[PDB]
Amino acid sequence: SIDVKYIGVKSAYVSYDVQKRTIYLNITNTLNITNNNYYSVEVENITAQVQFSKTVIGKARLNNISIIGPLDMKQIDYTVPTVIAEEMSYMYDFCTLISIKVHNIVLMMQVTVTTTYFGHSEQISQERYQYVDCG
Amino acid sequence: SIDVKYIGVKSAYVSYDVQKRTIYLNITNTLNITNNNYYSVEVENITAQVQFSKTVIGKARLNNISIIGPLDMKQIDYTVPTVIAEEMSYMYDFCTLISIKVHNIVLMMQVTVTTTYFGHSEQISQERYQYVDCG
Amino acid sequence: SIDVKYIGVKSAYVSYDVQKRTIYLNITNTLNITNNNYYSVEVENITAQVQFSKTVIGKARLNNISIIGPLDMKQIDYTVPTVIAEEMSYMYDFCTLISIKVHNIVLMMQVTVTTTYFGHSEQISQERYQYVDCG
Amino acid sequence: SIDVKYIGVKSAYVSYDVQKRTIYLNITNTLNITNNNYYSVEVENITAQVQFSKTVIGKARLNNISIIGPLDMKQIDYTVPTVIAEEMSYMYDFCTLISIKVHNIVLMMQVTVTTTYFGHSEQISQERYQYVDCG
């Protein structure tokens, strides 16, 4: 990649910016520029490419074969009980969380058994997060 | 990629911006520019490409074969009980969450058993999040 | 990559920026520039590439074969009980979290059994986080 | 890579920036520049590449074979009980966390049984974090 970037607040080529109780006074702001940006990306002069697969079987005898590809989950539990047995009793609760198997961002590519692959591949995930907030 | 970017508030080529109790006064803001941006991306001079697959079988004998591709889930549980047995009793609750298997963003590409692939592939996920907020 | 960068607040080519109780006064700000940026990335002069696979079987005898690819999960538990047996009793709670198997960001690429691969591959994850906040 | 960098607050080519109770007064700020940046990255003059695999089997006899690829999890537990048996009793709680198997950022590439690979591969993870905050 080129230029992959995370600005928390503010960004610029230039900024004469100001704020609050500012007496920006009697000013000469000049700005001659000559910004000239060129890009030549993933450029391919190829005269012969091939992606050949060949699967020859003859007089063979094949039993109890299992190709499992990735991320086989199996026989999973999440047992999560709660009880509140009150008697002559005050309860207050607040911001009271029972998170179980939360996801947010789940990106996959070329999750395979096989691949003949040829080229650019990419993954990008700029962000802000906050799971919980209270007062 | 080129130029993949996350601005929290504000962004610009230029910004003479101002705020609040600002006496921006008696000013000369000039700005000569010559911004010249060129892009030449994923450009392909190819004289011969091939993606060949061939599957020859003869006098073979094949039993109990299982190709499972990825993400086989199997036999999963999420048991999540709650009880509130009150007697002569005040309960207050607030912001009281029982999240179970929440997702947000789920992007997939080339989730296969096989692939002969040729070219650019890409994935991008700019964001803000907040699961919970209270007061 | 080129240029992969995380700015907490603010960023620029230039910044004459100011703030609060600022008497920026009687000023001459000039700025001659000649910013000239060139990029020539992932550029490929190839005269012959091949990705050849060949799978010859004859008079063979094959039993109880299992190709598992990665991330096979199996037979997993998460037992998480809670009890609150109150009598003549005040309870206060706040910001009271029972997180179990939370994720945020989950990016995969070429998670395979096999791959003949040819080219650029990339992964990028700029961010801010905060799991919990309270007062 | 080139240029991979983490700025906590603010960044620039130049910054005449100012703050608070500033009397920036009677000033001449000039700035002649000639910033000229060139990049020539992952550039490949190749006249013959090959990625050849060949799998010849004859009159062989194969039993009880198991290729497991990486990250095989198996038979895992997380038993996490809590009890609160109050009688004639005040409880206060705050910011009271029972984190179990939280992740944040999980990036994988070429997690395989095999790979014939040819090229650039990359991974980058600029960030701020804070698990917990309270007062």
Residue numbers in the entry:
A (entry chain A), B (entry chain E), C (entry chain C), D (entry chain G): 120 to 254
What does the published report state?
pmcAmyotrophic lateral sclerosis/parkinsonism-dementia complex (ALS/PDC or lytico-bodig) is a fatal disease found in the Chamorro population of Guam (1–4), some families on the Kii peninsula of Japan, and the Auyu and Jakai people of New Guinea. Abundant filamentous amyloid inclusions that are made of all six brain tau isoforms are characteristic of ALS/PDC. We now show that tau filaments from Guam and Kii ALS/PDC adopt the CTE fold in brain and spinal cord. The greater heterogeneity of amyloid filaments, when compared to CTE and SSPE, probably reflects the fact that ALS/PDC is a multiple proteinopathy based on neuropathology, as suggested for cases from the Kii peninsula.
In addition to tau filaments, we also observed singlets and doublets of transmembrane protein 106B (TMEM106B) filaments (fold I) in the frontal cortex from cases 1 and 2, and TMEM106B singlets (fold I) in the spinal cord from case 2. Senile plaques have been described in around 60% of cases of Guam ALS/PDC and assembly of Aβ is believed to be part of the disease process. Alternatively, these changes may be age-related. This was probably also the reason for the presence of TMEM106B filaments in two cases from Guam and one case from the Kii peninsula.
